[model samples]
Target chain A: PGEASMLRDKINFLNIEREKEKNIQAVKVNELQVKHLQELAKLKQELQKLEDEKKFLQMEA
Target chain B: PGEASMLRDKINFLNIEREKEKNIQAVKVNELQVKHLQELAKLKQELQKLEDEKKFLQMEA
Candidate 1:
């Protein structure tokens, strides 16, 4: 009974640890995705500003 | 003996599967990073071209 209970507990611990690691990886991936999107948005804004400036320069010319 | 061997194999299999999943996650993250860098580089090139065009217009004006 004692040995069996210990083995069961060990297995449960391992499974819980595995699940925790998986969740951590998911969170990390989500954060990276959000950061990438934010950076992409910023780049788009910068491009828009540059395009607007180019249009202004063309008009001036 | 048979039961113990079977239990050991199951544990080993579980560990291997966990490692496999972790490696897959790592590969996904690496791919995203590479794609993000490629996009950023493209944006920079576009920005450079626009800046040059604006400079040319300014010179013409």
Candidate 2:
């Protein structure tokens, strides 16, 4: 048990590292969804501006 | 034999700690996703309010 199988240690390390990578990927996806929603809000703002302008023009007429 | 057992115990502790960290990270990511969805819903509500206001103004004209 003094040398204790270097290959086994390496495999264990790799398995744990892979699990960490998967968790990072999940976090990235959540950040991406937040950005998408922010863009959607921006587009909604643009549409609201257009609608407001149209209403003002109609009132002027 | 005591030294060998002590080293084995250290390795075991490290592995358990790593596993706990991984689980915590997963839970954090889940919470982030829930928060992002809630913010999106809030933005949608604001958009709906603007749309309603626009419609009311149009009718006034």
Candidate 3:
């Protein structure tokens, strides 16, 4: 009975640990996604600025 | 003894599943990283081309 009880505890611990890992990984993935999107947005703004400048110059010429 | 063996088997299965999930997530994160890097690189190339054009125009002016 003691051995069975210990095994049950171990099983519970493993399940909790697995769930914790899953939540942590989800957060990490979301954070990475946010970072990637912000970088892309910033680059897009820079690109637009450059494009506008080029167009202005072309119009002047 | 049978109950103990069954518990042991359940524990083994849970552990194996956890390992599988870990490997899958690792690959997913790696693929995301690769995708983000490729997008950034492409944007950098475009930015460089635009900057070059701007400089060439400035020199012409």
Candidate 4:
């Protein structure tokens, strides 16, 4: 039959849509992970600078 | 009965394909993580070397 069955097509469409939504969500999660890594790098640099300053002060004393 | 069988077959095929894709993605993600960790180790070593050089320079002054 050419006519679309509401029950069958609806379920199939929903399954496909769910998969698409999950794929998009995975990408968003990956983006957040990259952002987190960047923040971590920034924090590490700040810490290293502070440590270097501390060492210089100790050496001067 | 045959219509139900056909729908079941399609669903099974899709499920298997999805699982295969998911496994491949998981392996890829693991490979990326290992590579990232290796790069992080190299970066840490470089940072430590730089710190050591700075300390030596300060001591010389």
TM-score of chain A of each: 0.84, 0.70, 0.94, 0.82
Off by over 4 Å in 2: A1-44, A47-61, B1-3
- The parts of candidate 1 lying over 4 Å away from their true place are none
Output the number of the TM-score-best candidate: 3
lDDT of 2 by residue, A1-61 (tens): 5434553475478678868877777778778777877877786777678667766756775
Q: For residues A1-61, write the lDDT of model 3, one tens digit per residue.
A: 7777888999999989998999999999999999999999999999999999999887875
Q: Largest DockQ belongs to which candidate? A: 3
lDDT agreement of model 3 with the native: 0.95
Task: Please give the distance, in angstroms, between residue B15's alpha carbon in candidate 4 and its true position after superposition.
Answer: 2.0
lDDT (CA) per prediction: 0.85, 0.70, 0.95, 0.68
DockQ of each: 0.60, 0.09, 0.78, 0.07
Instruction: Give the per-prediction TM-score of chain B.
Output: 0.82, 0.73, 0.93, 0.78
**Residue pairs that clash (backbone atoms under 3 angstroms), model 1:** none
Q: lDDT per residue, candidate 4, A3-54, as tens digits?
A: 3243357458758865895687589659856965995597578558857775
lDDT of 2 at A40: 71
Question: Of the pair 2 and 3, which is ahead by DockQ?
Answer: 3
Candidate 3: residue pairs that collide: none
* Candidate 3 error regions (>4 Å): none
lDDT of 1 by residue, B1-61 (tens): 5555556666788889888988899999999999999998999899899989888888883
DockQ of 4: 0.07
- Winner by TM-score between candidate 3 and candidate 2: 3
Q: Which stretches of candidate 4 lie over 4 Å from their true place?
A: A1-18, A21-25, A36-61
Could you give candidate 1's per-residue lDDT for residues A1-61 as a string of tens digits? 5555556666788889998998999899999999999999998999999999988877772
